[PDB]
C-alpha cells in the first residue's frame, strides 16, 4: 500500500515517484500483453481445429473466434469499477491467474477429438474474460503518472497490450510444430512433409508466462455509477461510440476473422505463416494515428481514414475467388490496408472523442468534464469490443446462409459508407 501518494509535485515524482510509476508500468504492460494474447487465442486455434480430428462447421468456427469479444465487451464496465476496491495489484494478480483456467482447459479439449461444440462455447467465454483486463489495466496505471504525463504512459501501456494479438498469432502457429510437452503425453498429429502437430502447445504455452506475470504482479506492484451514469445518457455518446465500432471494432473483428476467412477462400495457402502482419501493423498504425489525430486535425484524419476503409472494403470484392480475381496476394494486400486504416482510425477516433468531450462538454466545467469524458471513454471502449463479435459472426452467418463472404462484406461497405457520411454531417 502506498500511503501518501502525490505524484503531481515535481519533487516527489523525480525523487521517489517516477520509479514506482515506471516499475508499475512495466509489470502492467507485461500483464496486458499476455491478456491480449489469451483474449484473441481462438483466431489461430480454429484454423487448425478441423485438421486434428474435429469436424466443426464453418459457421461454428467463425462463432468461436467471434464469441470471446461478447464476454470481453460486456465485462469491461465492471472490470473498470473493480480496481478501486482490491487495488490494481491484487486485481492484477487475480485477474491474471484466472486465465490459466481457459489456457490449461483449452489445452485439454483440443486433445480429445470427440469433444462437444458446447464445451468450446464456455471456453470461448472464459477466454473472452481476458479482454476486460484492458479496462482495468487502463484504469489502474493512470493514477501512477502525473495528470500531464498520462498521455505517453497510457500510450505505451495500451499500445503494447494491443501487440499481444500480433504476438500470440505468431507464437502459436510456430510452437505447435515442436513437441515441447510430449513428456506430458501431449498428442501430436502428423501432416504433409513431416509436420507433426501438437495443438495443445498453442494454449499451454501461456501457462508458464502467465504464472511469472502473476508472481511479478504480487511482488512488484503497489496498491494506491454516480457521475458515469450521468455521462452516459447524453445522445452524443452514441453517434461517437459508433465510429469507434468501425475502427477499433474492425481491428478486433478482422483479428479474429482474417485467419479463417483467408482459409475458406484460399485452402491451398498457409495463413498462420503470415496472418500476423495484420494485428501488428494494426497496433503500430494505431499508436501512430493517435499522434497525428492532434497534430494534423482530429475530425480530418478520421474522415480521410474512413474514406480509405470504405474504398478498401469495396476493393475486397475483386479478390475473392469466383466473384473476381481468385488471387491470394491481392486479397492479402487489401486486408493489410484494412488493418492499417482500422488502427489508424482506432486512434484518430479516440483523441477525437476526447477533444469533443473535454470541449463540447466543457462548456455548460474544467475538472468536471474530465469525469464525463473519462466515463465516455470507458463506455466507448466497452461497446467498441462488441465489434469483434460482429465481423466474424457475419462472415459466419454469410458462409452459412449463402456459402459466401459477400453477404457480410456488403454489410461492411454499407457500414463504412454510412460511417463516412456521419463523420461528414455532425463532426
Swiss-Prot record:
Induction: Expressed preferentially during the stationary phase in the absence of nitrate.
Periplasmic side: 46-65, 112-114, 191-195, 263-270, 322-327, 396-405
Effect in UniProt of substituting residue 88 to A: No change in activity
Effect of residue 290 to L: Loss of activity
Consequence of substituting residue 164 to A/S: Loss of activity
Any one GO molecular function term: nitrite efflux transmembrane transporter activity
Effect of residue 76 to F/H/K/L/N/P/Q: Loss of activity
Impact when changing residue 387 to L: No change in activity
Domain of life from the UniProt record: Bacteria
Biological process per Gene Ontology, one example term: nitrate transmembrane transport
SUPFAM superfamilies, per database record: MFS general substrate transporter
Residues passing through the membrane, by range: 25-45, 66-86, 91-111, 115-135, 170-190, 196-216, 242-262, 271-291, 301-321, 328-348, 375-395, 406-426
Keyword match Membrane: yes
Entry GO terms, CC: plasma membrane
Keywords: Cell inner membrane, Cell membrane, Membrane, Nitrate assimilation, Transmembrane, Transmembrane helix, Transport
Function: Catalyzes nitrate uptake, nitrite uptake and nitrite export across the cytoplasmic membrane. May function as a nitrate/H(+) and nitrite/H(+) channel. Could confer a selective advantage during severe nutrient starvation or slow growth.
Protein name: Nitrate/nitrite transporter NarU
